[PDB]
Amino acid sequence: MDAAIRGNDVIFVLKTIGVPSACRQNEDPRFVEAFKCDELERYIDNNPECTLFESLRDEEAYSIVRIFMDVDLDACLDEIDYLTAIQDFIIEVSNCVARFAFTECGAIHENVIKSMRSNFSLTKSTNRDKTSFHIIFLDTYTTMDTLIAMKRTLLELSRSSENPLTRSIDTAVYRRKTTLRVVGTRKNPNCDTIHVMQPPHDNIEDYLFTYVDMNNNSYYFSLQRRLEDLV
Amino acid sequence: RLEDLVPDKLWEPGFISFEDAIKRVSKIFINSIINFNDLDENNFTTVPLVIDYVTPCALCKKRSHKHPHQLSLENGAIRIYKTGNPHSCKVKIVPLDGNKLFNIAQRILDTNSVLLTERGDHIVWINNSWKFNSEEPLITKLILSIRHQLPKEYSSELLCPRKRKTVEANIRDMLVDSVETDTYPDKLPFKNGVLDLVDGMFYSGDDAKKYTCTVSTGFKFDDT
Amino acid sequence: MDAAIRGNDVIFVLKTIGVPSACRQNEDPRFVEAFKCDELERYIDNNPECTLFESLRDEEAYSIVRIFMDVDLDACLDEIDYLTAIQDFIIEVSNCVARFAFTECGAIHENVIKSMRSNFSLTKSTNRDKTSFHIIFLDTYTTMDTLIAMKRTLLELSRSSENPLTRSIDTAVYRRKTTLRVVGTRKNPNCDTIHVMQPPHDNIEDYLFTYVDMNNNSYYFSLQRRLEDLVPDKLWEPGFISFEDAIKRVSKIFINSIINFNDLDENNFTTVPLVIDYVTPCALCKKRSHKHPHQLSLENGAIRIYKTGNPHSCKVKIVPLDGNKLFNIAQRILDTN
Amino acid sequence: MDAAIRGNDVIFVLKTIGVPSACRQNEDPRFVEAFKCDELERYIDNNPECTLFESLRDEEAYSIVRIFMDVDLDACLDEIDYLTAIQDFIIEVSNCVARFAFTECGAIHENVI
Ligand SMILES: Nc1ncnc2c1ncn2[C@@H]1O[C@H](COP(=O)(O)OP(=O)(O)OP(=O)(O)O)[C@@H](O)[C@H]1O
Numbered sequence: 001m002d003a004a005i006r007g008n009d010v011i012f013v014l015k016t017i018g019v020p021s022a023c024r025q026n027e028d029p030r031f032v033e034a035f036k037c038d039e040l041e042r043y044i045d046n047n048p049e050c051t052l053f054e055s056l057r058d059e060e061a062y063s064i065v066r067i068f069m070d071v072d073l074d075a076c077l078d079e080i081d082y083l084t085a086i087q088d089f090i091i092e093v094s095n096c097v098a099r100f101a102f103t104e105c106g107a108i109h110e111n112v113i114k115s116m117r118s119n120f121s122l123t124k125s126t127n128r129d130k131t132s133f134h135i136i137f138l139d140t141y142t143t144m145d146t147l148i149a150m151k152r153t154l155l156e157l158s159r160s161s162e163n164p165l166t167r168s169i170d171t172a173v174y175r176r177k178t179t180l181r182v183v184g185t186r187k188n189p190n191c192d193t194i195h196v197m198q199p200p201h202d203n204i205e206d207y208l209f210t211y212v213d214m215n216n217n218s219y220y221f222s223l224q225r226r227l228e229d230l231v
Numbered sequence: 232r233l234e235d236l237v238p239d240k241l242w243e244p245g246f247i248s249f250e251d252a253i254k255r256v257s258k259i260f261i262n263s264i265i266n267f268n269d270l271d272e273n274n275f276t277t278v279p280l281v282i283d284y285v286t287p288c289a290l291c292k293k294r295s296h297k298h299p300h301q302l303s304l305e306n307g308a309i310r311i312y313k314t315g316n317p318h319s320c321k322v323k324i325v326p327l328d329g330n331k332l333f334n335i336a337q338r339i340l341d342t343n344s345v346l347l348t349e350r351g352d353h354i355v356w357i358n359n360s361w362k363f364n365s366e367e368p369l370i371t372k373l374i375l376s377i378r379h380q381l382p383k384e385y386s387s388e389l390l391c392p393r394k395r396k397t398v399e400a401n402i403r404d405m406l407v408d409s410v411e412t413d414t415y416p417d418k419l420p421f422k423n424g425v426l427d428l429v430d431g432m433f434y435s436g437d438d439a440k441k442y443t444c445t446v447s448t449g450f451k452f453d454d455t
Numbered sequence: 456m457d458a459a460i461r462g463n464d465v466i467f468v469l470k471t472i473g474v475p476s477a478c479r480q481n482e483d484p485r486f487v488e489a490f491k492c493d494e495l496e497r498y499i500d501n502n503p504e505c506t507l508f509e510s511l512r513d514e515e516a517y518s519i520v521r522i523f524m525d526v527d528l529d530a531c532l533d534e535i536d537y538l539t540a541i542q543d544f545i546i547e548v549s550n551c552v553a554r555f556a557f558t559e560c561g562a563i564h565e566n567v568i569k570s571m572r573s574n575f576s577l578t579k580s581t582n583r584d585k586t587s588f589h590i591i592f593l594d595t596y597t598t599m600d601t602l603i604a605m606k607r608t609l610l611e612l613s614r615s616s617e618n619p620l621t622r623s624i625d626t627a628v629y630r631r632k633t634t635l636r637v638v639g640t641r642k643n644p645n646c647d648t649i650h651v652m653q654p655p656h657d658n659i660e661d662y663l664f665t666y667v668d669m670n671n672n673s674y675y676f677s678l679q680r681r682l683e684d685l686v687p688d689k690l691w692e693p694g695f696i697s698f699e700d701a702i703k704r705v706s707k708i709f710i711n712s713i714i715n716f717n718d719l720d721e722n723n724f725t726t727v728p729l730v731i732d733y734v735t736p737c738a739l740c741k742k743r744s745h746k747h748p749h750q751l752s753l754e755n756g757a758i759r760i761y762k763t764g765n766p767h768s769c770k771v772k773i774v775p776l777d778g779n780k781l782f783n784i785a786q787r788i789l790d791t792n
Numbered sequence: 793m794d795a796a797i798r799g800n801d802v803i804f805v806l807k808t809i810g811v812p813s814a815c816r817q818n819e820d821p822r823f824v825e826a827f828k829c830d831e832l833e834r835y836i837d838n839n840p841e842c843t844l845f846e847s848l849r850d851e852e853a854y855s856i857v858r859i860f861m862d863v864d865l866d867a868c869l870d871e872i873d874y875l876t877a878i879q880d881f882i883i884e885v886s887n888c889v890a891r892f893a894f895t896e897c898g899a900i901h902e903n904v905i
Pocket residue numbers: 250254257263264267268472473525527587627630634635636642
């Protein structure tokens with residue numbers, strides 16, 4: 001546990017879906033770059049038509065990431081129902097993540113619950129037909145390997161509920177060397193739907209799941225066992 | 232092949248029979264479907280249902296609708312949405328996975344209110360204090376108490392004593408690992424929280440829960 | 456009140472499931488047929504695997520039908536448990552529809568109660584995977600539209616009753632050109648599970664709800680208005696909780712006092728804005744005050760409490776108004792200490 | 793590649809949208825029927841108001857079918873603009889199918905076009 005383990009201020013983003021692995025390995029400036037929080041804002045402003053794909057730079061070197069999720073519901077939702085739906089969504093998700101963090105991760109169950117429902121970052125898509133967003137938990141740090149093992153129970157949770165927001169959970173994102181589209185950019189140069197920010201969080205630093213900055217209210221937990229004994 | 236294409240279908244095994252699934256949908260529409268005979272396991276996501284409106288719709292509470300409704304399948308549950316103007320009618324979801332009381336037992340389990348001790352007793356967490364009993368288990372009392380912290384469609388289902396018994400029986404079949412108790416030696420457990428000793432502050436509610444204190448002083452704390 | 460409605464002994468049947476509507480009006484032998492009960496029985500014997508579905512010939516001709524219902528149970532139970540459950544279930548259903556008859560049909564309450572509780576027929580599905588059987592009272596007659604209009608009150612009873620049978624009554628069969636499978640026939644050419652007779656009734660005529668025969672010990676009633684005249688119930692529904700108890704529960708969460716507590720009635724609570732003064736921090740958002748008042752709204756069986764204007768500023772609270780009946784009894788026995 | 797993979801000239805046609813599953817397997821003549829091309833032409837002329845729907849009889853046995861598309865434009869279009877639109881429509885759909893065939897199917901890009 002050195003200084004670099006309690007901090008990660010380097011951002012690794014892509015610029016096009018389906019980048020070949022060799023082009024990723026050679027770190028060519030044509031496909032992949034490194035960035036800072038302030039610099040990334042300048043890059044987006046200078047390219048109002050760009051397309052970025054946030055991802056993990058190195059898997060085995062650094063695995064600690066923030067907890068993130070994805071939702072894609074193909075129907076408009078009224079505001080009062082939307083508020084009602086999102087209250088239950090946080091309630092059910094918080095319990096399920098904490099429960100696994102206590103039964104196979106050896107962490108304090110009540111500590112995780114307080115840290116997640118306290119401060120979470122919510123986005124909203126600009127499309128008016130469907131409702132989608134990227135909910136990111138801020139003060140809950142864990143390794144990529146834990147989230148991969150978290151996939152099986154999350155799929156069971158999404159399939160066994162009634163709330164439309166928690167039933168449309170995208171469980172396919174959790175894999176090796178994941179990609180999440182950054183806020184404010186398009187999907188393809190032909191797409192006209194982008195993601196915008198939400199109050200009270202305004203700085204861009206609050207929307208990258210690779211940013212590790214553990215403060216006083218942060219909590220950490222990781223799988224004690226490895227991924228090879230788990231047949 | 233399809234294995235490398237997608238591990239998805241339109242009707243995977245384990246789902247309920249199609250005729251039963253449609254029966255559930257016909258229950259939500261309190262009125263009667265007019266073109267019901269146009270549905271089978273191959274076109275139910277394309278044929279629009281021409282409902283008749285004698286009574287107000289059970290989904291939007293309007294007297295009648297301009298356009299027919301239409302179904303769609305997603306993530307193991309068929310969705311009901313109305314064509315035309317999407318904001319005119321609400322969204323209703325019909326599940327297909329399994330039963331409901333097992334889901335209730337699961338939800339009661341995630342919140343970490345029931346635990347298994349070495350002696351075999353099941354401690355519960357009610358009124359901000361861990362309680363237990365041998366001749367009469369307290370699981371049903373905890374279920375009825377925690378009824379409130381669940382969504383609406385789950386709360387009303389939790390009143391019939393037989394159904395509470397079923398949920399309790401489901402709960403008792405998930406606890407397999409024992410948990411030790413009373414490992415913190417410098418705390419004073421009260422009837423409505425635990426008073427910390429190292430700095431004098433008095434926690435309550437969620438905060439005063441990780442300290443698994445079984446025995447308690449028996450009276451409430453009065454900070455005044 | 457002519458003899459045409461005094462006698463209807465023509466049974467109309469269908470052969471296959473999902474019969475196309477393009478052929479029923481043409482009355483093709485291959486899909487439909489007319490029969491007499493004696494002629495019906497021999498046809499069943501001659502074709503052991505035949506599937507038959509009784510249907511009403513023409514809605515505008517003879518709409519009078521017997522009082523029938525279906526119940527579907529998704530598990531198995533003991534035989535004594537059936538005996539005690541069916542008797543209570545018969546008693547409970549008798550009370551509800553009789554009240555509806557005395558309310559929207561202008562019929563004598565005790566006459567209706569006596570008529571059906573005297574005689575009834577019972578079937579049973581041999582499928583032990585899930586039990587489901589028909590019940591047909593013999594001495595109660597009414598038109599099709601009466602059952603259609605009463606579709607709502609049956610649903611309310613099924614939600615807030617006790618017996619497993621009445622908890623799973625199916626009101627979907629009450630529709631236009633409804634189909635009831637005759638007892639003793641398969642549903643599909645592959646499933647051998649059929650409905651079997653039960654003692655003491657054995658005659659086929661006492662198992663069809665289209666065979667109408669007014670004798671001197673039967674009662675008939677019908678709706679007075681037309682079907683396209685029904686007005687829905689008010690914002691409230693008379694089946695969960697009285698109004699004052701619900702309002703008090705709404706009043707208990709609001710720590711501050713409600714100034715306009717007196718103008719809320721059983722109809723205006725969904726529109727009157729709850730203008731409140733925040734002497735204490737708000738019980739929901741823990742804020743000093745707010746720009747706009749709160750509001751009430753009934754939906755699905757709750758009171759979604761929210762603040763209008765900018766709803767995202769204040770949290771949303773839901774009051775669960777329960778519809779159970781014994782739970783209220785338990786609450787009342789408890790609060791008296 | 794055999795004649796079963798080189799020949800399919802039997803037409804299996806339904807008689808009402810949404811045929812029940814319990815009868816399609818049994819091939820009830822009241823709901824479904826198999827025909828040849830010549831007998832198909834006679835049947836439609838025999839019945840003035842029939843309602844037919846061609847489908848695939850056995851999915852897992854013979855899965856080889858042609859390429860088909862459907863267009864439902866709820867707006868009147870003049871013939872001259874109709875003529876120019878359909879050609880460029882064939883232009884656009886040609887490139888889309890050809891690109892994927894060269895991408896994930898290995899087909900000859902010029903040949904598919
Ligand atoms: N909404 C509906 N509109 C039209 N017909 C319907 C509707 N719901 C059900 N049906 C018809 O009612 C039939 C009932 O068959 P079901 O599978 O329920 O048989 P069951 O459980 O043996 O009992 P029963 O046939 O007496 O209802 C269905 O096969 C279908 O033909």
